[PDB]
Design a protein around this ligand. Sequence first.
Ligand code: NA
Length: 129
Amino acid sequence: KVFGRCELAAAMKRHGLDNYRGYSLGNWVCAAKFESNFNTQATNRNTDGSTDYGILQINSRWWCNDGRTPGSRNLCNIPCSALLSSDITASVNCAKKIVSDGNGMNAWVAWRNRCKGTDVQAWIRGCRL
Ligand code: NA
């Protein structure tokens, strides 16, 4: 599923991401935009052999099991393919564990490089939230 901007914001808000660990909703929408272009089926392989999955590009090195990342962890206790569903519940619940690990949203390289220090509230402007 390719989400619309406000559709995603509303779904993220419903699942409790607005101001989760202090990150306003605009941060999460900006991150999804530059990680996946709002596409739940997005995948990308990393140089170390691991793969990033879903609207928030969650990594198989630590967070999910894809059967092809040897020596990795599965800290969200999910198959990575669950992160590609049109239902973002698994992605959002896993993202809540990542952002709590001590590094905040700096865990997402796209957020640090393209969202951090910008006006992230612009990403929800015009949405009925
Ligand atoms: Na893994």
